[PDB]
Amino acid sequence: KIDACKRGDVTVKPSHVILLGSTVNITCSLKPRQGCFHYSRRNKLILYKFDRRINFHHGHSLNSQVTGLPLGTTLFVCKLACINSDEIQICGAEIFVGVAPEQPQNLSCIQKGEQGTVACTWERGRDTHLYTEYTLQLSGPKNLTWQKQCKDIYCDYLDFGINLTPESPESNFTAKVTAVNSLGSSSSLPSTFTFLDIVRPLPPWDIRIKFQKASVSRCTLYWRDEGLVLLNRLRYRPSNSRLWNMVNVTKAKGRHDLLDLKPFTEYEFQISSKLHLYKGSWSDWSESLRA
Amino acid sequence: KIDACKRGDVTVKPSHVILLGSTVNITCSLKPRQGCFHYSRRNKLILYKFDRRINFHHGHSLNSQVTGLPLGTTLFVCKLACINSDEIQICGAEIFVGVAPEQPQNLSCIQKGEQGTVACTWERGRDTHLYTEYTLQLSGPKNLTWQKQCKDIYCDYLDFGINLTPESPESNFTAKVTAVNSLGSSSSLPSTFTFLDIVRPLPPWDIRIKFQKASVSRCTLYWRDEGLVLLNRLRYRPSNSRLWNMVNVTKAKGRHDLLDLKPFTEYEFQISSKLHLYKGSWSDWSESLRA
Amino acid sequence: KIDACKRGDVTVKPSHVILLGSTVNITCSLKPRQGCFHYSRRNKLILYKFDRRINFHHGHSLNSQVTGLPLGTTLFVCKLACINSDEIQICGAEIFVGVAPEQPQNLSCIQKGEQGTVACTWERGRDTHLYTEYTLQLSGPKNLTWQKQCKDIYCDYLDFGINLTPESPESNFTAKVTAVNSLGSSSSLPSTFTFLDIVRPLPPWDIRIKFQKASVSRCTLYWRDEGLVLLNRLRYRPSNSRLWNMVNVTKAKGRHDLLDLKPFTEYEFQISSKLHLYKGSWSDWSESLRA
Amino acid sequence: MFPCLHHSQNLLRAVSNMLQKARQTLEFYPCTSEEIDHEDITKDKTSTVEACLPLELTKNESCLNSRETSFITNGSCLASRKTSFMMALCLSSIYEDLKMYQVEFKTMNAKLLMDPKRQIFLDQNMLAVIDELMQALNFNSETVPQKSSLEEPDFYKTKIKLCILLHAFRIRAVTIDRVMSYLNA
Amino acid sequence: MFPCLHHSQNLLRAVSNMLQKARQTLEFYPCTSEEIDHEDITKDKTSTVEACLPLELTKNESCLNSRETSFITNGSCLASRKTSFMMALCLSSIYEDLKMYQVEFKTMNAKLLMDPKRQIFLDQNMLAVIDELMQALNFNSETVPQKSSLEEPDFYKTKIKLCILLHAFRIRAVTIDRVMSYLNA
Amino acid sequence: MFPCLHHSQNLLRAVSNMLQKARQTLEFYPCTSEEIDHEDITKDKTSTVEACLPLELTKNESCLNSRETSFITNGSCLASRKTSFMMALCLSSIYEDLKMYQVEFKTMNAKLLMDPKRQIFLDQNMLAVIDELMQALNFNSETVPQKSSLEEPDFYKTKIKLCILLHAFRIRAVTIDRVMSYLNA
Amino acid sequence: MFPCLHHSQNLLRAVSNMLQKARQTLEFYPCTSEEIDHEDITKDKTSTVEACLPLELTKNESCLNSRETSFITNGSCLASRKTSFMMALCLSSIYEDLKMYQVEFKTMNAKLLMDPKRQIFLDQNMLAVIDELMQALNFNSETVPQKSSLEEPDFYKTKIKLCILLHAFRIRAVTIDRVMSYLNA
Numbered sequence A, B, C: 001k002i003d004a005c006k007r008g009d010v011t012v013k014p015s016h017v018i019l020l021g022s023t024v025n026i027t028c029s030l031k032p033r034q035g036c037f038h039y040s041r042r043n044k045l046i047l048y049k050f051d052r053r054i055n056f057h058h059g060h061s062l063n064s065q066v067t068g069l070p071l072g073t074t075l076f077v078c079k080l081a082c083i084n085s086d087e088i089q090i091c092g093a094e095i096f097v098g099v100a101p102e103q104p105q106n107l108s109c110i111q112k113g114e115q116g117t118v119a120c121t122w123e124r125g126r127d128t129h130l131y132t133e134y135t136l137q138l139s140g141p142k143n144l145t146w147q148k149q150c151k152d153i154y155c156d157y158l159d160f161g162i163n164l165t166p167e168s169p170e171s172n173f174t175a176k177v178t179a180v181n182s183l184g185s186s187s188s189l190p191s192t193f194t195f196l197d198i199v200r201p202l203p204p205w206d207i208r209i210k211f212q213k214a215s216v217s218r219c220t221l222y223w224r225d226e227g228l229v230l231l232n233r234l235r236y237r238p239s240n241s242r243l244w245n246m247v248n249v250t251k252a253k254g255r256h257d258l259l260d261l262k263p264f265t266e267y268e269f270q271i272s273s274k275l276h277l278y279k280g281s282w283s284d285w286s287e288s289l290r291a
Numbered sequence D, E, F, G: 001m002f003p004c005l006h007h008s009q010n011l012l013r014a015v016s017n018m019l020q021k022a023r024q025t026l027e028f029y030p031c032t033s034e035e036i037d038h039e040d041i042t043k044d045k046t047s048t049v050e051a052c053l054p055l056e057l058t059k060n061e062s063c064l065n066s067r068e069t070s071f072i073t074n075g076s077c078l079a080s081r082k083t084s085f086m087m088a089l090c091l092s093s094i095y096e097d098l099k100m101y102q103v104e105f106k107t108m109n110a111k112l113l114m115d116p117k118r119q120i121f122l123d124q125n126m127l128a129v130i131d132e133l134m135q136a137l138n139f140n141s142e143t144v145p146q147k148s149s150l151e152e153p154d155f156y157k158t159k160i161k162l163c164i165l166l167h168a169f170r171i172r173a174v175t176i177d178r179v180m181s182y183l184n185a
């Protein structure tokens, strides 16, 4: 059995993890068999924080009560100094000062495209100086559920690998995030999302410009995107200065008889689609098409 | 959108999932545009359970109140019979009669060997005729829990992939199992297990028989097993008739000066080891060694 | 097209490859458009072998006749020195002096075990300072041959991937090796080998020592080897001093009633097998068995 | 021998076995070819019905509507410089047909698993064959993400829709097989 | 971290080690950067010199000459809908640059092996890195066939051409590395 | 060239880099060879100290204690009929030494990850090299299961134990390298 | 389900199809079970006839002759600590039976290819199944080297020997299948 501390053992009261503001009783105790080979009233049993002397007792039992510890870890190492020999490190304690975990104030779940993996994002709050474990739970109408745990201390987001297929377009799904640390536990308020709110249409991948198969000013734009789109929007703004973009386009993959400027000067084109007008987010504008 | 039901739609009150004993209002309704091409007072709108007639209304609206449904699924299909044409299936409902889920009375977690994956086993109880989801949670001394879901309707056991390394041999770890179904939720009582209780030593893999390097009756048995064993037991029973096996052996991988019968007749040998005498399960007897 | 020589071109007569003893006419010629920018009777057109001056002509045409070149490669580089500018390398020639290739005096083909890949070995002879290509051809009684080329300049042996299954134990197979180099070609004399000569039995892999299941001096040796062995030999020599080993053993995988010394002192044991007594090579002695 | 033709022959055989299982499992649900209407999900989205024809059969080229969905995705089934556009558009449309069906079949299977009993579930082997064929058809193959629901759907509707899709898919599988045979010969 | 950037960083390091070996092996042959002229085989064939620039640097777009060699081969290094055409043309041109060099390097190596001694031979690891990067750059990667000759070439000319190519290739390798770093960030 | 020797040379180099990182990360924790006692976990369990010697050095064979732990596990590093028992026992004992260390190193790493900060964590590459060498040493390789704890251990004790193990393991790594060199030559 | 049992069931089916082909191809050569004598090449070399029995059937253990050919080769089909020696010896003997047959079948196939016509040749799939089963049975599997002859053998003798081996091998294949079923249950 490998043992880190052989000469003596050091105890901490109440524990290595303490609430910000508490006082720890670091006590260095030396086993009777171990000790300075020659008894002398010169040898000492020092205690050091970051190699800084805090106490010194000739006797094997050393007691200290450190206070006002800041957030972080402080290494208290208790070395033995003999009469002529160099100091031998005996044992030490690492103390993590921590505070109660922040509750996530805002939780949002976004699925990219009709086929996508749901991803939920939260505001962690102040960082407790402690290991942090995050649990994300998603439940449907009745209480079935999916849970995943983000063991990583810092998590940008947690993604449910399982895709969500909604039994009906109007359903209620509720998501909650729980943060647990040695000192305490904070749980976010339940947030209820309908499937349309979670889904976000993909930007239209395709784009084509045709001048109505003619030299005429009128232009026809042939783009392609996800099948379930009941709305759309197009940018007809002149390239040199942005002006106005039509709020809505008809449910046509291929634009027809769009009003375009008579010159053939290059014009930037951007396109967006809305899965549902009543409760669907707008898609990101498609890569600009030059001319 | 492929539509299974076009001619008409059938509704169920309150829902397809009902508690054992409840009564469902299956109501078959026909859309006005669809119907018998020739109005006649001969055409009917039948409702069938497992192809057995339960009701018949000439009018488009048919109402039924089935009662005393047993546990299981009953297919109520509502067909349209016209005057001379054959019956056209219009729409149907599948009803799952279920009961509240049984709580697991006993939960036991066993880890095989010093290095093993913890596996927990429970008594499911009566089978509710419904989809069953089982969640197994393991919490250590402070609150840090591993979340695993057995989505399979029948689960013999759920295994935690991560091996448990105990900070100290005496620690308390608590395990709970939760069963959730459309109708209700039952959670097993928390059971607290120390690491020694969970661990079960492996049967000694190796075995060797030597007669003290001599023709003498005394025999030496050279076996090998997991390193952390503080106890052991050996079977010295005569092969022809089992007699008695020593309760404990010294902490020796290689037995020495064991009392063995003077004849060279074949003798079966079995060996077991105990990781901890105070709170450790006995290992399974090793494969019998002939002679 | 990256062009190595732009300022001028150098020719060699007869060729870069020459027989040992021949004289090469290295001639450095400068294209008219290229040359020293300022005509002066100070600029020279030097020719260097291993950066050692051999000739110098002011005129664009430089002629040299190097003689007594030793075996190897000599780099003749022809640089241009102008009046004040540093020498610019113009073009160069690498000459490989070589001699006619040695014929392989001895060719032997050995197959390891009943199942083995035939491998043929030859004595290359003196190394010609030239690229060497070796072709090994094996022809059976029927005029069908396997063609394999050892393009590597130095070849320890060439191995035929296909195993040879002999239509009859007495057959004649003939093997020849051909060496070809820019200067000449030498072919080894055809060597005819019967299948028994090519095959060499594997050393017996297994060995067991038993004293006739008793404390008696007589010993029984249970070894295992390739199935088609019609002979065998055993080493009964005392371990401390080698004495004599029996010339032949009966066709028994397991030796029985072998005469062994009464003491139990450790004895080395070696075993060999002969596939055919009339024309089969002896197998290598098996790993010594201690005691 | 054409490797894609072998995959297509495997596809038709896999659908034939699954269709036989579906009829046996769903005894009451009507799943005979006579009682099941033909409905094709890919009716307007893809041009397999027109583009996938023998070169002799297609001539006017007027009916190919403005190079409909002319993505012409390059793939390992053919070679880029090997065959005419008429077969290049066809291979892309066949890839799209398999993508539309696989996404739907996975959605049905995820709903079927929730059933308290296991009356019927889509063949894992058949789904794997569809994915393997798509990988050869187009290099930029997208693997459908595991689909699941947090609620329980009506099972009768899924079982009627399943039978309607299986029969329509079987007709599509023969059409793919005919094209693969033409490419081989 | 960008996987193609890691391959490009591996390429520059592999060329640096091979260039050091070449200078040590060919003591007389002049292989110092001062005595070796810069000659680029891909001078007019590819548009890496112009297309591969940071988006901020390229603006008029007039200098891109009529979308020169605008194959825009799709590949695993980028995603089809991820980056602007300026980087799509650049990745195709980089693939073409590596194809032109690998075909030439293999031809030189086959001639070098015939030498009675083994003064120098192209690093197998460097050639493997070039192939691995090309596979990521374009799905339709063509593997060069084993090249050999039935006669023996002059070795001095091959050794001078080798030094000229190695130095030019090293400059190309840094240019690829800069583009990969820009794509990552 | 011996493949196991290459793995052993990789092991010694990986430990050397990890040991340098450990000294830099733990500035206060004493991790110099002078202040760290030599403690070997495999002191009595394995016979590598005695079995792994050049054939010339070992002669009396009396010191090999009753074929201690003579499992003689067959493996891809040597061939079954290739070398003497003295090296067969040595290869088995080396496999056992790597198994004892890997199980312990994984336990330490699982405790280290829980630290609020990331002052030090065992090199994943070093652990992978240990597993690769064990796979070659013995066919019946056991992969250690992912280890985790439901509580937080004192970190100072783990960091002192880590330094003691790293230095002892480095000495073991040189011993394995010497044996692999002897097998090659 | 037992993976080795699946391989053994594949083996019996493969032999059954090859045996049917052999009878159809060799119309004159007598290949009916009635006219072909039973001759087993592995008559004395292996103890499959005695060792491979259900545990209930074998009791006296006297008939196992002095642990005949008791190599007990460890393998992936069983686990080292899983089953009794009676099945461990049986698995080794079955591996040896497959090695004796595969070496002979390859020798016959190499002679059959030389025939001016292609009346019959051993099924490549059947040979592959024998190799796959052997790999699972014993880790130290030896792959038979490609066999060839430099002369042409009489074909009638090879075709009579072939029929004698196929029928005997089929009986051996059922014996392996029975043992695999017993191991599974």
Ligand SMILES: *[C@@H]1O[C@H](CO)[C@@H](O)[C@H](O)[C@H]1NC(C)=O
Residues within 6 Å of the ligand: A013, A014, A023, A024, A025, A063, A065
């Ligand atoms: C620390 O120890 C001192 C004396 O041993 C005692 O008076 C005090 O209450 C202790 N405080 C804590 C927080 O344990």
Ligand SMILES: *[C@@H]1O[C@H](CO)[C@@H](O)[C@H](O)[C@H]1NC(C)=O
Residues within 6 Å of the ligand: A142, A143, B182, B183, B184, B185
């Ligand atoms: C679902 O869970 C919530 C909170 O646990 C509870 O209030 C509600 O009654 C549950 N619903 C059912 C149907 O069990």
Ligand SMILES: *[C@@H]1O[C@H](CO)[C@@H](O)[C@H](O)[C@H]1NC(C)=O
Residues within 6 Å of the ligand: A170, A171, A172
């Ligand atoms: C979801 O909840 C909202 C408000 O709580 C309610 O208006 C709506 O009907 C609910 N939807 C369903 C499907 O129950």
Ligand SMILES: *[C@@H]1O[C@H](CO)[C@@H](O)[C@H](O)[C@H]1NC(C)=O
Residues within 6 Å of the ligand: B013, B014, B023, B024, B025, B063, B065
């Ligand atoms: C069923 O319907 C009838 C009449 O429509 C009504 O009287 C009864 O209360 C209903 N019962 C349930 C359980 O809905």
Ligand SMILES: *[C@@H]1O[C@H](CO)[C@@H](O)[C@H](O)[C@H]1NC(C)=O
Residues within 6 Å of the ligand: A182, A183, A184, A185, B142, B143
């Ligand atoms: C741990 O959890 C249990 C139940 O949730 C609770 O009673 C206990 O106070 C918790 N302990 C801590 C330290 O949070």
Ligand SMILES: *[C@@H]1O[C@H](CO)[C@@H](O)[C@H](O)[C@H]1NC(C)=O
Residues within 6 Å of the ligand: B170, B171, B172
């Ligand atoms: C575990 O719990 C038991 C009883 O609840 C208690 O006696 C024991 O001290 C506990 N162990 C620890 C480490 O707290």
Ligand SMILES: *[C@@H]1O[C@H](CO)[C@@H](O)[C@H](O)[C@H]1NC(C)=O
Residues within 6 Å of the ligand: C013, C014, C023, C024, C025, C063, C065
């Ligand atoms: C070399 O050249 C000289 C003069 O050019 C000529 O006399 C001589 O014959 C030549 N020798 C050979 C071997 O070409």
Ligand SMILES: *[C@@H]1O[C@H](CO)[C@@H](O)[C@H](O)[C@H]1NC(C)=O
Residues within 6 Å of the ligand: C143
């Ligand atoms: C075989 O080849 C040798 C040499 O080429 C020749 O002498 C002999 O006649 C040949 N035999 C036949 C049968 O062709």
Ligand SMILES: *[C@@H]1O[C@H](CO)[C@@H](O)[C@H](O)[C@H]1NC(C)=O
Residues within 6 Å of the ligand: C170, C171, C172
């Ligand atoms: C092989 O050649 C030798 C001598 O040339 C001859 O005695 C022997 O009969 C030959 N064998 C065959 C099979 O022809």
